[PDB]
């Protein structure tokens, strides 16, 4: 009979378990025997207090490095403001020690936990790449609660070294099964930011994770976009509880908040899932998330049923992670087929955008060829366009099965005249659909201003397979 943790703050970890069903169903995974034994998670952040009384027992120097100062020791830099507490807070969410009379517990409280000190300094492309590419045959899961500015006007993604690190990780990392990269989708809600304008979250190689408040609402800080895959609980208003974790200076906090707290909880759940099946590939893990995540009782006004019967929201992806369902489905999971990539260059000539542009194209999705896709995973609309005020644009993509993805919503603060330069807007919302047939791209001016520009390239990039479908939900 499984005995739940006795830690003093565990009863305040409302998001892990409860009679109420507003939780991530983590105790159900623990009771199946999965606590993270043998799995290695690394927090890429401002350091990790490796001697914290709730982290030391799980700390793993092999999962750690200090990229900012070029040494092995990721200990945070102590200041009066406690600026560099952020990584320690994230680490305790994943892997705080259980049943030790200190603070609460991690989701994967028997996993090994490390930290890369890489935010406490100038975060160059090289710094990111050395962090994403750290010890990729030892570290299983990387968690990143940072990214481009959330001012609602930035379009920014991994530069060359960082992108190379993503590809090397998913291709050769973890014995060829692929590094698992977990990303916080962003804090730009107040600025009406779009997490598709962030190349880290928008990447197919990252599991981008959004947030829900305790009462099941879209937090003030949440960014909506089509690249988000799923959700975990985080903070909300001041009547709603927050996240309990290890804090700097060997303390415990019950007030960890924002997008930052959601990715580590997902990383912990993924750690439990990998313990249940160590042979899972990076793509397998995204399939498991798609199939097991739960929309129920998450409030949003944009819930839509996609072509295979799954509910999907731009605020929540496929919904809340469900650890018990993840570990259960992982155990007998059949590895997915190798990833195929079908490239469809849509335009025969540039198109003036004006007030509204609709581009319709019927595609065969590489019929007759070895990259024929009948089962979509990610889809990208790689767009090159000029426009005089970028944030007045709204961009939608409709799949042949009728699923309307918002690739870009209006961004009031985005005054840029720089347009998009082959920007690979990504959607997860057509996962498992057949992509053969008519795709529709819609670009519209959401403002009354007389804006002007031209779409010069639209590449539809489809990823996926040609086998193994489930009966639609």
């Amino acid at each position: 009979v499984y005995q739940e943790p006795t830690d003093p703050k565990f009863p305040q970890q409302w998001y892990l378990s409860g009679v109420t069903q507003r939780d991530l169903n983590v105790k159900a995974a623990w009771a199946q025997g999965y606590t993270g034994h043998g799995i290695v998670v690394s927090i890429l952040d401002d350091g990790i207090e490796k001697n914290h009384p709730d982290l030391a027992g799980n700390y793993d120097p092999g999962a750690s490095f200090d990229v900012n100062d070029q040494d092995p020791d990721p200990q945070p830099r102590y200041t009066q403001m406690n600026d560099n507490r952020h990584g320690t807070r994230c680490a305790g969410e994943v892997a705080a020690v259980a049943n030790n009379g200190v603070c609460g517990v991690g989701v994967a409280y028997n996993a090994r936990i490390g930290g890369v000190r890489m935010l406490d300094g100038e975060v160059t492309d090289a710094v990111e790449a050395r962090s994403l590419g750290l010890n990729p045959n030892h570290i299983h899961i990387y968690s990143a609660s940072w990214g481009p500015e959330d001012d609602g006007k930035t379009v920014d993604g991994p530069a060359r070294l960082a992108e190379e690190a993503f590809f090397r990780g998913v291709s050769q990392g973890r014995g060829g099964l692929g590094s698992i990269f977990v990303w916080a989708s962003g804090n730009g809600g107040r600025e009406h930011d779009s997490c598709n304008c962030d190349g880290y979250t928008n990447s197919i190689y990252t599991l981008s994770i959004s947030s829900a408040t305790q009462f099941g609402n879209v937090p003030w800080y949440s960014e909506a976009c089509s690249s988000t895959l799923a959700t975990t609980y985080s903070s909300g208003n001041q009547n709603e509880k927050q996240i309990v974790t290890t804090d700097l200076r060997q303390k415990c906090t019950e007030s960890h908040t924002g997008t930052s707290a959601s990715a580590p909880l997902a990383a912990g759940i993924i750690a439990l899932t990998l313990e249940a099946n160590k042979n899972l590939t990076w793509r397998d893990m995204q399939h498991l998330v798609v199939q097991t995540s739960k929309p129920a009782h998450l409030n949003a006004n944009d819930w839509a049923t996609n072509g295979v019967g799954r509910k999907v929201s731009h605020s929540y992806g496929y919904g809340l992670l469900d650890a018990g369902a993840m570990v259960a489905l992982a155990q007998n999971w059949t590895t997915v087929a190798p990833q195929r990539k079908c490239i469809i260059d849509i335009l025969t000539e540039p198109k003036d955008i004006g007030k509204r542009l609709e581009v319709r194209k019927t595609v065969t999705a590489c019929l007759g060829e070895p990259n024929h896709i009948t089962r979509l995973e990610h889809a990208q609309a790689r767009l090159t366009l000029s426009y005089n005020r970028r944030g007045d644009l709204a961009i939608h993509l409709v799949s042949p099965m009728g699923t309307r993805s918002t690739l870009l919503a209006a961004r009031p603060h985005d005054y840029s005249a720089d347009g998009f330069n082959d920007w690979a807007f990504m959607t997860t919302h057509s996962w498992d659909e057949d992509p053969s047939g008519e795709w529709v791209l819609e670009i519209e001016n959401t403002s009354e201003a007389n804006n002007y520009g031209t779409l010069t390239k639209f590449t539809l990039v489809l990823y996926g397979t040609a086998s193994g479908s489930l009966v639609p939900r």
């Binding site: 952040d45 952020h86 935010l119 975060v123 481009p148 500015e149 959330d150 920014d156």
Partner: peptide, 4 residues
């Protein structure tokens, strides 16, 4: 950039 990169912000926490």
């Amino acid at each position: 950039x990169x912000v926490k």
